[PDB]
Amino acid sequence: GYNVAQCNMTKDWFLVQMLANYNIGYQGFYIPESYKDRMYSFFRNFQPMS
Amino acid sequence: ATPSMMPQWSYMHISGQDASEYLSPGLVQFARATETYFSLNNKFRNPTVA
């Protein structure tokens, strides 16, 4: 059960991306602020489907 | 009455000093040194009085 976010992605990659783009993850997860999340960022362009 | 009349309200940080005061100064400096990559800015509540 390494999948997360109800997608087919392992936890570790999710953590790595969240860190590398927001320094977020060692203390939980949440929605990063708008001005720190521009158009080409990671989070705005992540859609899970099933 | 002045809150310092009863000690409990001072003990539970309901009224009295702020965050920067009661802490041993070494830890205050430590926190101010690592605000970015390991937060501590929400582990203690500093009260306010009208």
Residue A26's contacts (CB-CB under 8 Å, 6 or more residues apart) are A19, B38
Residues 10-49 of B with CB under 8 A from A: 36-39
Q: What angle do CA A34, A46, A9 make, to 5 degrees?
A: 130
Task: List gaps in chain B by the residue before each (C–N > 2.5 Å).
Answer: none
What resolution in angstroms does the PDB record give?
4.1
Nearest to B28 by CA among B36, B40, B38: B40
DSSP string, B4-35: GGSHHHHHTTSSS--HHHHS-HHHHHHHHHST
User: Which residue is closest to A22 within chain B, CA to CA?
Assistant: B37
CB contact under 8 A, A23 and B36: yes
Residue with tokens 């936890």: A11
**A9 beta partners:** A4
Given a contact cutoff of 8 angstroms between Cβ atoms, the answer to whether B18 and B46 are in contact is yes
Give the CA dihedral A30, A32, A33, A37, nearest 10 degrees. -160
The alpha carbon torsion through B36, B41, B42, B46 (nearest 10 deg) reads: -170
